[PDB]
Structures are given as structure tokens and as C-alpha cells.
Design a protein around this nucleic acid. Structure first.
Lengths: 52, 211, 147, 204, 95
RNA sequence: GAUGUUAGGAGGGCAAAUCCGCCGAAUUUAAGCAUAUAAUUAAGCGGAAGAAAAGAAAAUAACUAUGAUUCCUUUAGUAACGGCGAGUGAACAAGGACCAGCUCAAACGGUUAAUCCUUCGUUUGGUGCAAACCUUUCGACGGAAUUGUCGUU
RNA sequence: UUUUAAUUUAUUCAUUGGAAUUUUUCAUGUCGAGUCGUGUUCUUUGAGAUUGGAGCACUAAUACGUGUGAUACAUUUCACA
RNA sequence: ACGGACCAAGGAGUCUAGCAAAUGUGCAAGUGUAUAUGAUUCUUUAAACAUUUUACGCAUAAUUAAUG
């Protein structure tokens, strides 16, 4: 019988979480990865686009 | 048992499923507590909800060097601040009748912390522009203008926190003033060796002074 | 990760990997540490030699706070303080660092390692090893006893 | 200052006067019914040193209790069980006779009142006597009193049955603090539950 | 270990008077009630026994009195105190 | 002491997840089994609240000392208990949540019980359409109480 | 709609009692008894020459006392309540 | 030798605690931010984010019944 004391959550190292966030930002910063992810950015001027 | 494992030690030989409990509500409780204390400090109308506590030295040889917030100032330090316990407990000063000031350093430092809190206090009149001189060491009530100009100022909560201790674990001395004759290990061994007989001497001193 | 479990790959194998002859009974050797000295004695003697019996006297209530003392060895005092300050105490022969080890969180100074030759250093600690004292004095330093 | 003299006299219990007085009083109590109301506290000093006061809603009841231990409740001395449990004679009840005495009167005989305390009064071979102070929580004389009216609100019903009187505090181990009690402090069962209850965090 | 009330602690961590070097800092009614209560009550029977044992006034007699008081009262200090006060009253009535 | 269809009141039963007392096993584990374990558990009896219980040191420490209770992290599967086998197993300090202290007894007050309750009346103003409700202090009567209420600390 | 903060305004006259601290003297007062405690028996505990509780027997001292300081004692310091 | 008349649906090494090994990952004489707190976060969010320059675990030193 399923019990509520299953290991629902997980503890993730803070350093690993920060590494992952940094890497995600870097990956968002390159055109090929954003294109391969699924977005239609063929008409964007640059991938790390910033607006006023 | 088999192979090279630590011998099992699990203390689960009783009905433990009845006693298992898991804190699904840790962050929910955190939010509820934060909301409750925020509502408290919003309800008490600008008076901080914290109470001033003394700083005391932690017991035992393990935590000798560390200080922490203790429970309540003592009668001696309240008197040194010129503040009766009855009146101090009405302006956010914690007081306990159990602590005693075994050292002048603790007495002076808690007294000066009390005085800092006291002069940082600004009292609100009990009767809406009926400012009076106070009683029992409570400061005189502030006036309408100063209350008006101070209520919009950020209330400092630094005095409520335990004080940060300076970190001078590094020092510099001249090589000329180094005692090359000292024998720390020898002194330690000698003190341990002589402890028993000096306890004797103190025992006899106490007996003699008893008369 | 229940799809990585080894039982899944024995899904149609009758015995579930637990043997056709010996089978998987429930507690066929006893429960917990049952058979020690009797039929698990070889296991106990081979992997946990001194398990049975008792030695020494009883300390009725311990109070580990009384005897808690962390140790720092003599070869880490210079590494306690930052590198540019090592440099600044190094080139200047008229000053020496006074290190209150108790403040960093060690109570005893042990003597393993090698201090820098002709580099005086004053150490404050609650306890000192004799060899630690000898090395500190040998490099021209001094041990200060503190509480 | 009369109560001081009364207290010091009652501190003897072996003097000729006190011996005779106790003997005659315990003889009277033996003939009186098991639990009966008494007009005034037989020991005014001890009663008032306990919670007793002399206003309208306060009542004193004298109660006998049989001495010795009660023997196991098994039909003859059979005990179907392990030899560690065969004993039937030397079974010492955890409640003391004083607590049993206050229960005998507070359980149902006077269910309107609330037990405050009880004291000594006398002994004999087969009975221990006691007087129990009871408070009427419905009398205005106690309801309006700023003191003592703490007993009126319903969280103090049947203190003697909940082990909340002085005798209950004694036999629950609450009369000793520190390392000599340690476990009993939040109640024994609650402390055991806390100690052996296991807490698991969601994210481990 | 033992400390000292004066002569502040040495900065040493082990030994007599050790530790940090902080600067330390520092009948008319009862007996009347006793007399009246004594007059009205008297002595308990074991008090009488101890009194007569003391009145015998030998070394063996006083040893026996200490033993008897200790047995009657439990503990050694209670028995010793009882014997000593009974000796006091024996002298005070022997005058 | 009785007795009262005297006047005014209370208790009783249900409900239990949490809570407080009592009473109290065996299955089981030890590869047998008897101490031990299961377990100060299940079953049984009784008693409360929106929480209960604990609680203002006849505490801890041994330090530069802490300061009611409860709970969380930890101390710690540790000190210890145990056919020292199987197994069992705390406390202090430390970090936090919360934070609150008090009153009887005893003392003192007799140019004066200064206390308390019942019953019957009086008004002080207020929110309600109403029903009702909140404030109100001047009594009078009958009692309780010196076998001790109230005030002071 | 509930309450609950800040804000708005209070002014004249009066005597009735109380409170805190600070000056100057008295007196070191009181402080919970079949209770604590001890022995023994049973239970309970990690508590071990007994952790708590209970039954029975004995049964205290008066603050200079008595209770803790985890090994039973005697003489005794100290600390803490 | 035992089970199986037939068909459908259901049907059995899982969950938790604790230890180790293995491997991947992060940091490294340090590592893990525990409980908790803050903060224009409050559908999601019971997650994410953060932690005024000696809390605690494990490691950094062993050995002895033990004063050490």
C-alpha cells in the first residue's frame, strides 16, 4: 500500500543548483541551442536579446 | 547477517508506523508564523515586537568564549541603568530574578547596553498630548512634534540582536618582547600535579575562616 | 527509479533470481544479529573481531562538553592567516604573528609537521603538546597559555 | 498566631496528648460512614495552609480508605502468561491512598463540586482517614472572588480523576524536577511518544 | 576543581583556581513557641529512650544511643543531630 | 447531625483524531526458552479542551557560567541498561520557534470584618424596529464569617 | 460587514485615594509534618550497593536548616536551589 | 508424482529507516546551510530565491580501562 512517507522531495546541493542556473543562462545565450529547443527565432537579430 | 557489513542497529522493533510523521507543511507554517508576527507588529502601532535581552556568556568550557542573548536583565544591571524591574518590563525590557552578576565586565556591558536602549527609546504619552516625566526610570514622554518626525523613521532593530564580536585572532608583536624562557607544557603538567594539594589548602583556608 | 530495478529483468523467470532449490524463505537464519556465537560465529569473528564481551570501567554520565577539545597541528598555524600576511610576516624579521588558536576554534596544539626555519611565531592556546612547544621555541617563537 | 501552635502540636503525633486525641478521633471515624460531610475542617491550620478558605462554597468531606495493596484482579491466582507476570499479591498500585480517597468522594458522590486538596487526619490498622476540600464552582461567593475562581471554569473538572491534585502530582513524578525525573515532565506518555516518534522531512 | 573567592583566577586552563581572569565581585518568638509546645507535648517514646541512654552516661551507652537514634530516624546525620540535641537538653535539665 | 415535592442551583448521557489518569496482556524476537523483547503497547475503566498536560527551580552546571514550561535541529543510537545475548537507551550544554509572570499559606493591620453572599429597590448613560443587551452606585433586608473574610508584602 | 492601527482637541475648577524610587531609624521575621527521609517489598527507568512511584514499618530538622552535585560509607569544604 | 475443465479481468522482491560498495555530479581540508528567519513570491508557489566577515553532523589524528 502506498504510504505518505515516500521520499517525495529531494535535497539538491546549493552549489549544484547555482551551477545549473548559470548554465541555463549561458545556454539561453546561444542561438543554436535556443533554436534546437523549439523556439522560432529565425528572425531575431541576436539570441541574448535585450530591450529598453 | 552476511558479508562485511556493519552490524545492524535499527530500532524499529515496535509499532513505528503509528509514530511516523512527515512535515509537508514546513514552509506553510513558516509563512503563517511570518504573517502572524507581521500582524502583531502592525497591530501594536509602531512599537517593536522584540524585547531587549542581555548578552551573556554560554556555560561550560566548550562555549566559554561565545556570547548569546540571555533571558532578562538582572536587578543589579537594571538598577545600574536606574530602572526598576516592574517599570522595565513595561518598555520591552526582559528581566529575570535568577541571574546574578558574577563579574564586573558582565555588569558594566549589560548596563551600557541598557543605557543605549534607554536613550534610543522615545516614549509615547499615555494620554494623547499629556506628556509627563515618567516613573521608575522610564524616560519622560516625547512631545507631539518629535513623535511625528520619528514615527516615519526606520526603527532600528540592531540593539535587539546579539552583538557581533570583533575577530582579532591575528596580532603582531615585536620579536624583541618574546619570552623565550616560558615552558607552557611544564606549567600545565605542574598545575595538574599540584591541583589536589591546593584543593587541600583551600579546604583548610575555608575551615579556618569559618571560625 | 523503479524501472531500473533488477527484479524487472527477471520478470518471466519463475524464481525471481532467488534460486530454484534454496528458494527465498523468510528469515531462514534468524532475525537481526541472532546467530552470533552459534552459527553466524564465523561471520562475526571474520568481520567484527572484538564484538562480544566488555572492557574498561563505566563513566556514569559523560558530559562531553567537559572534555571537548579540538586539536590543530603545528604545521597549520602559518596557514591559518592569509597569504599576504604570511608574506608580510616573512620578509620582516622584527615582528611575529600572535595567533589565538582558541578563537579559530581549536583548544590544543599538536606537534606534527614542520614550522618554517627562523620564523618566530607566538601561539595562544589552552593546551600544548610538548613537541609542539619544542618546535615553536625552536623556530624562535613562544607558547602562551590562555583560558 | 494560633495556627503556629496548632501546627507544632500536630508535628508531634506521639506525645501523650496527641496520641490520645488521634486515638479517640480515629475511633469516631471508624464508626462514621465511609464518606461523610463534616461541618468544619478538623485541622483548620492544615486545611487553610492547603487551599481551604472560609467562604460559602467551600466544603469538607471525611473519607476512609482501606490500607494495603489491592491484589491482582485475576480469577484466583491463575494468570495465563509468562512467569514474569504470575505475581498476584505484591502488586503495588501507582496511585496513592490519598488520591484514591479524594477520588472516592469526587467521582460521583459530589459531582457538582471540585476537589482542591486533602490532608491527613488519622490512621489505623486497616483504614487511612482523610479530609478532602471541595469547592462549589456554582456559588457566587467563589465565582465573584478574583482569587480561587480559577476553579470555576470547566478545565478543572475532576482533577482527582485526572491526577491534577497534589496527590496526583506526587504519584505522577511531578514533585521532583531535574535529572531525577527527566522523563515525566510533559507527562510520561506524552514524553514517551515524543521520544520514540520519528520525524521525516519532505526533501530528506 | 576548587576556586578561590579572592586572588583572581590564573589564565591557565587546568589546575586550582583556573579560568579566565574576569574581575570577581562579592530571638524571642521561635523559642517561646518551642517552650510552650514542649510543655504541652513532652517527648516521644524514642526520645525518652535516648534520654535515658544518655543519662546512663558511658561510652558504650552513648554509642548505643547513636545507633538507636540512627535506626529510629533513618540516615546518620539525623540520628547524630537527634543525639546531640538530646544531650543538650539532658545537660540543660541536669543543671 | 437528621428531615423537608421549602428557594435557587449543579452532576448523570453522547461524542474521541489530538489530550489527562488508572489497569494491563499475549502473539513476536532471542532462530529453543524461563530474565529480557514485544510494551510502560493492544484490549478494559474513568476525565477534559479548542487545544489538553507542563510550567515560574528544593534546576543545570563546574564555566568568563546559564535562568519557568513546551516544541523543532542536535547532543545521539551517545552515557548507560542487558542470559552484557537478542535487544534497549536518556540527560546537560549549543542553534531556533515562542516568550509572562504570578497568588495563597505564613508576616503585619483590633479607637473596632476594614470582608462576602442572598433578596428587594434607585439611577449613570448607550448601541436594538423589536426581542434583548452593555454600563451604573446609592442603598435596605436576611444571612455567612473571628474555628478568620479582606487590605500590606 | 468585523476589528484595529495612525491621525483629530481638548480647556477651567476642586479634594480623595493610591503607587515607584530616593533620604533618616527599627528586627532579622516568615518560609507548607505521618511530610521529607530511611529500611524493606513490588513495579518502573538508561539510572547502574535503586530513576521515579506505590504498599508497610520507623519517622525528622527549622534556614548556620534540608535537598541536589548519576558508586555504598564516615569527617568536612564548596556550589546551586 | 502433485496443480491445471474453459475464457476474461485482477495477481506477487515493493516502501521507509540505516550502512557499505560501485558509478555519475558539485565543491574540496573542507563539505552539508539543520531548525529557523527575509522578501513588492504568494493560481502555479507546499517551489524557487537568499543567509552582517567560531550553531551542528561527518572529515581534518591516533591511542589507552583510564588520570590522559
Amino acid at each position: 500500500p502506498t504510504k505518505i512517507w515516500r521520499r517525495w522531495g529531494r535535497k539538491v546541493n546549493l552549489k549544484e543548483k547555482r551551477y545549473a542556473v548559470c548554465s541555463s543562462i549561458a545556454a539561453s545565450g546561444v542561438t543554436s541551442l535556443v533554436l534546437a529547443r523549439g523556439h522560432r527565432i529565425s528572425h531575431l537579430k541576436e539570441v541574448p536579446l535585450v530591450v529598453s | 547477517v552476511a558479508h562485511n557489513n556493519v552490524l545492524p542497529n535499527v530500532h524499529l522493533h515496535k509499532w513505528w508506523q503509528r509514530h511516523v510523521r512527515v512535515n509537508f507543511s514546513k514552509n506553510i507554517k513558516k509563512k503563517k508564523r511570518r504573517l502572524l508576527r507581521e500582524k502583531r507588529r502592525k497591530a501594536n502601532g509602531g512599537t517593536p515586537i522584540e524585547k531587549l535581552h542581555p548578552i551573556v556568556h554560554c556555560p561550560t568550557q566548550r562555549y566559554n568564549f561565545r556570547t548569546r542573548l540571555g533571558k532578562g536583565f538582572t536587578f543589579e544591571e537594571l538598577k545600574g541603568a536606574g530602572l526598576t524591574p516592574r517599570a522595565a518590563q513595561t518598555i520591552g525590557i526582559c528581566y529575570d530574578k535568577r541571574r546574578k552578576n558574577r563579574s564586573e565586565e558582565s555588569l558594566t556591558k549589560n548596563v551600557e547596553r541598557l543605557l543605549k536602549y534607554k536613550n534610543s527609546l522615545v516614549m509615547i504619552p499615555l494620554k494623547k498630548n499629556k506628556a509627563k516625566k515618567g516613573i521608575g526610570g522610564i524616560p519622560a514622554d516625547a512631545d507631539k512634534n518629535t513623535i511625528k518626525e520619528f514615527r516615519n523613521k526606520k526603527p532600528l532593530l540592531s540593539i535587539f540582536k546579539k552583538e557581533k564580536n570583533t575577530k582579532p585572532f591575528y596580532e603582531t608583536i615585536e620579536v624583541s618582547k618574546i619570552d623565550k624562557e616560558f615552558l607552557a607544557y611544564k606549567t600545565l603538567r605542574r598545575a595538574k600535579l599540584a591541583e589536589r594539594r591546593k584543593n587541600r589548602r583551600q579546604q583548610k583556608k575555608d575551615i579556618k575562616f569559618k571560625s | 527509479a523503479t524501472r531500473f530495478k533488477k527484479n524487472r529483468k527477471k520478470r518471466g523467470h519463475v524464481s525471481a533470481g532467488h534460486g530454484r532449490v534454496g528458494k527465498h524463505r523468510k528469515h531462514p537464519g534468524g532475525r537481526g544479529k541472532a546467530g552470533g556465537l552459534h552459527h553466524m560465529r564465523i561471520n562475526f569473528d571474520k568481520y567484527h573481531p572484538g564484538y562480544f564481551g566488555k572492557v574498561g570501567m563505566r563513566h556514569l554520565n559523560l558530559l562531553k562538553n567537559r572534555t571537548y577539545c579540538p586539536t590543530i597541528n603545528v604545521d597549520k598555524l602559518w596557514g591559518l592567516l592569509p597569504e599576504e600576511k604570511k608574506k608580510e610576516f616573512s620578509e620582516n624579521k622584527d615582528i611575529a604573528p600572535v595567533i589565538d588558536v582558541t578563537r579559530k576554534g581549536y583548544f590544543k596544539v599538536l606537534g606534527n609537521g614542520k614550522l618554517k626555519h627562523n620564523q618566530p611565531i607566538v601561539v595562544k592556546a589552552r593546551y600544548f603538546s610538548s613537541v609542539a612547544e619544542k618546535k615553536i621555541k625552536a623556530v624562535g617563537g613562544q607558547c602562551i597559555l590562555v583560558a | 498566631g494560633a495556627y503556629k501552635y496548632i501546627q507544632e502540636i500536630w508535628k508531634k503525633k506521639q506525645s501523650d496528648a496527641m496520641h490520645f486525641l488521634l486515638r479517640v478521633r480515629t475511633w469516631e471515624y471508624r464508626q462514621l460512614p465511609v464518606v461523610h460531610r463534616v461541618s468544619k475542617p478538623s485541622r483548620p491550620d492544615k486545611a487553610r495552609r492547603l487551599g481551604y478558605k472560609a467562604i460559602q462554597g467551600f466544603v469538607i468531606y471525611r473519607v476512609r480508605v482501606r490500607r494495603g495493596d489491592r491484589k491482582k484482579r485475576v480469577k484466583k491466582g491463575i494468570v495465563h502468561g509468562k512467569p514474569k507476570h504470575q505475581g498476584v499479591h505484591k502488586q503495588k498500585s501507582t496511585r496513592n491512598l490519598k488520591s484514591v480517597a479524594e477520588g472516592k468522594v469526587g467521582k460521583s458522590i459530589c459531582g457538582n463540586l471540585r476537589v482542591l486538596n486533602s490532608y491527613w487526619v488519622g490512621q489505623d490498622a486497616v483504614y487511612k482517614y482523610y479530609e478532602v476540600i471541595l469547592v462549589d464552582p456554582n456559588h457566587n461567593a467563589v465565582r465573584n472572588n478574583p482569587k480561587i475562581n480559577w476553579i470555576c471554569n470547566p478545565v478543572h473538572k475532576h482533577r482527582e480523576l485526572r491526577g491534577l491534585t497534589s496527590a496526583g502530582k506526587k504519584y505522577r513524578g511531578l514533585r521532583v524536577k531535574g535529572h531525577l525525573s527527566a522523563k515525566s515532565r510533559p507527562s510520561i506518555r506524552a514524553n514517551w511518544k515524543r521520544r520514540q516518534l520519528i520525524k521525516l522531512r519532505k526533501c530528506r | 576543581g576548587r576556586k578561590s573567592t579572592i586572588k583572581p583566577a590564573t589564565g591557565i586552563a587546568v589546575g586550582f583556581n583556573s579560568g579566565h581572569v574576569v574581575t570577581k565581585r562579592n530571638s524571642k518568638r521561635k523559642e517561646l513557641i518551642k517552650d510552650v509546645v514542649r510543655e504541652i507535648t513532652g517527648f516521644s517514646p524514642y526520645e525518652k529512650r535516648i534520654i535515658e541512654l544518655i543519662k546512663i552516661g558511658t561510652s558504650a551507652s552513648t554509642k548505643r544511643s547513636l545507633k538507636y537514634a540512627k535506626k529510629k530516624l533513618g540516615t546518620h546525620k539525623r540520628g547524630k543531630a537527634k543525639r546531640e540535641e538530646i544531650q543538650k537538653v539532658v545537660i540543660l535539665q541536669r543543671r
